[PDB]
Design an enzyme around this catalytic site. Structure first.
Site, PDB file in Angstrom:
ATOM      1  N   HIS A   1       0.847  -1.221   0.000  1.00  0.00           N
ATOM      2  CA  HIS A   1       0.000   0.000   0.000  1.00  0.00           C
ATOM      3  C   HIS A   1       0.877   1.264   0.000  1.00  0.00           C
ATOM      4  O   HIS A   1       0.453   2.251  -0.590  1.00  0.00           O
ATOM      5  CB  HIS A   1      -1.065  -0.055   1.113  1.00  0.00           C
ATOM      6  CG  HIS A   1      -0.574   0.148   2.505  1.00  0.00           C
ATOM      7  ND1 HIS A   1      -0.538  -0.873   3.417  1.00  0.00           N
ATOM      8  CD2 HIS A   1      -0.147   1.246   3.158  1.00  0.00           C
ATOM      9  CE1 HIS A   1      -0.085  -0.426   4.564  1.00  0.00           C
ATOM     10  NE2 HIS A   1       0.172   0.867   4.426  1.00  0.00           N
TER      11      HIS A   1
ATOM     12  N   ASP B   1       0.371  -7.798   1.063  1.00  0.00           N
ATOM     13  CA  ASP B   1       0.757  -6.413   1.346  1.00  0.00           C
ATOM     14  C   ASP B   1       2.258  -6.300   1.596  1.00  0.00           C
ATOM     15  O   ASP B   1       2.716  -5.737   2.593  1.00  0.00           O
ATOM     16  CB  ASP B   1      -0.036  -5.843   2.520  1.00  0.00           C
ATOM     17  CG  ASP B   1       0.009  -4.327   2.568  1.00  0.00           C
ATOM     18  OD1 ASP B   1       0.183  -3.702   1.501  1.00  0.00           O
ATOM     19  OD2 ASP B   1      -0.124  -3.759   3.673  1.00  0.00           O
TER      20      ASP B   1
ATOM     21  N   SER C   1       3.766   1.749   9.878  1.00  0.00           N
ATOM     22  CA  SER C   1       3.435   0.785   8.840  1.00  0.00           C
ATOM     23  C   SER C   1       4.621   0.595   7.904  1.00  0.00           C
ATOM     24  O   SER C   1       5.290   1.556   7.517  1.00  0.00           O
ATOM     25  CB  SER C   1       2.209   1.246   8.050  1.00  0.00           C
ATOM     26  OG  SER C   1       1.744   0.220   7.192  1.00  0.00           O
TER      27      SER C   1
END
Lengths: 295, 295, 295
Positions: B45, B81, B162
């Site tokens: 992402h 991801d 993240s």
């Protein structure tokens, strides 16, 4: 091994999964083994729907080994979000060492343990942030909402550890999780459970007032309605009176009022301090039981 | 110095900032150095938008010293991801000691480390709350959403950590953060990265079913659609069938179904257990690859 | 006793409850005793409403013993969400050992202590997640919003510990909580308080620009409006110019711009780096004071 890891492992056998299922629905929660005869304490919201519609719901307890065993409802208290289940003839049950909620202090490290084999199960860590904190709790279904004098924690309480235990650093249950984090203290739980086990019911005091909170320069629980025949209407409590002390527990808002009424003895006389039109009046009320026939 | 303070300091050199910028937009995330040749693992992402529009986007890696170096995309997997970047000729790179996600236990203390020089960077602390927990993840842009069999933690995972690592108490990467907290385990990451590095692509199994979750008395992944030519239509799977076991992984809902299909071997035969009209059928399906030409 | 339990107990005497009440309203917060003469530091939002309407509000400080004492406002800074109160002639006051916010490192364990006798009071635990992090803060009432260069923590900051101290593991105040968790550092607080105590006011630099953030390939604080007579219009700053360095603090967005202007000296000359139509210009501006008569 980790210090928190050693403790969660030592209690996972005592924590069980509770599964209530119908034709088209299913609820799930956690619970704790408190007695070797097969007595399991959970929350009332978890099983609320097996009790209001028993003809269509079935409740099973899943242990740490995957052994799935049918369960029966012993009793339930919607006012403390507590409930007792019983499994029959199951052996080798590892019981939880229950602790004393009166020796717990703010800042003590805790663990909010959920059921190992539960779906969205969670083991969270934190500290005890506040003691004797009233908290409103939403009652599931036909059940009534309530307020509980709880142990607050920054460990996350959620759908994955509700009904499971709040564990201290000696692997002892000091509370029961309810779904920033609040827990029902073990000392209130040991009392509610004893009555739910021996009678299938717990009787709580009622006075017959509805209250709204107020905070200004005069603060407490303001009276909205006094019921007819209620012990409050007999004791002289009037509409728009402000209650500041119930029995011997001072009351800062409507939530602490609910908690303080439950601490009164039924049928005994209790002082109730009120501020009315700027004057201080101390009334006297005798609490009725919520279920007469059962008291 | 603090015990958590010593550990975060020992890994900050291995954690880098990833900056993707266009004429009018800019995204930012974190990443981790896994190989001394200059291989950096992040989330998909974070870089999703440098890959779908490369003619207008440029990705740079900012190290702990403020040294800003251009970066190139090696490969990306929207289904885990995960993503790999490469910086060229940079030396003195401090590589991360990667650990084993199979030795991680619930209750172990962890640290969700973000990039030191990142804008909204965060270093959060917590414990491992659950292992092998399927979690839905929203795919950015043209990318598809996915479900990952993750390490859950109460340490806050957010925009500031993240793509950075989940670190244990020996300063070892046991997972990759993805944005109550979930992380991609290091053992799946080491596998996805090896294929993304050597091939620029990872091939995953497909069966051709769309599923919706169901929970009652009969529970699993209910079939919504079977595609034409799909291995599922050939294997006998039908609409409104309920899948409860895929290969050897039991399936409790549609999210665990997605995870269990990815665990099957491509072109090998796999048992698929189904409940249809109240009868138990065990079918047989051969998984296709999602990209044939690349397999 | 617990390690976190020993520390929270050692500081509870220094943390006080602040209660501001009118005829029909009441606010509540926490504060900390910094000086034995009776000087108490809290947030500005807690007391904002006693200062904008003093004819109808009254502020009292409740100590750990339940002793309730009237309090007077010494001074308040809406731009650092800080405020000083004074109680008179109270003795045996246990003062807080204030620490150094410059020795605090990311990952150090902290405690966000609230007032023991406060209503919704909370004691939360966590670590320092980020240092020198600008954060927008909403100004209560007629007050202006601001941005503060703060200590970020994963300990929950809320209505129950706002205004109370951020405590390290040596029981020292390293910050003041403001209501994922942010705290006003003690080194800025010791400076604001000294001016608020000695003068009842703190004077801060102004330049006269309003800024919006921008992030692309060219990033910083874009100029929306330059006021007439402002030091910025005199220094040559123009509309739609992009500021990237103020004084010697590089600026990544409008929030860090606000923080960097407050770090400049009033009436001294300051370099301001700007990107205009793709060209780099370094201007020179002399900051005015926000209150001339008081400077």
């Amino acid at each position: 091994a980790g210090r928190f890891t050693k403790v969660a492992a030592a209690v996972a056998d005592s924590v069980v999964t509770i599964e209530s299922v119908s034709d088209q629905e299913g609820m799930q929660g956690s619970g704790v083994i408190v007695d070797g005869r097969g007595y399991i304490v959970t929350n009332n919201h978890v099983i609320s729907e097996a009790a209001n519609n028993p003809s269509q719901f079935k409740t099973t307890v899943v242990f740490n080994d995957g052994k799935e065993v049918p369960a029966n409802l012993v009793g339930r208290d919607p006012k403390t979000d507590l409930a007792v289940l019983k499994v029959d003839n199951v052996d080798n049950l590892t019981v939880a060492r229950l602790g004393d909620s009166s020796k717990v202090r703010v800042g003590d490290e805790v663990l909010a343990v959920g059921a190992p084999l539960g779906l969205r199960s969670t083991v969270t860590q934190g500290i005890v942030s506040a003691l004797h904190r009233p908290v409103p709790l939403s009652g599931e279904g036909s059940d009534t909402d309530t307020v509980i004098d709880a142990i607050q924690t920054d460990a996350s309480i959620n759908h994955g550890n509700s009904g499971g235990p709040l564990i201290d650093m000696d692997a002892q249950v000091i509370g029961i999780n309810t779904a920033l984090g609040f827990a029902i203290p073990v000392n209130e739980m040991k009392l509610v459970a004893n009555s739910l086990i021996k009678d299938g019911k717990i009787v709580h005091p009622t006075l017959g007032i509805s209250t709204r909170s107020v905070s200004n320069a005069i603060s407490g629980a303001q009276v909205a309605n006094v019921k007819a025949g209620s012990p409050a209407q007999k004791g002289g409590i009037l509409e728009n009176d402000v209650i500041v002390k119930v029995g011997n527990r001072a009351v800062a808002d409507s939530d602490e009022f609910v908690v303080a009424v439950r601490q009164l003895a039924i049928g005994q006389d209790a002082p109730i301090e009120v501020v009315r039109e700027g004057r201080h009046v101390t009334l006297t009320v005798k609490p009725d039981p919520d279920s007469t026939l059962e008291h």
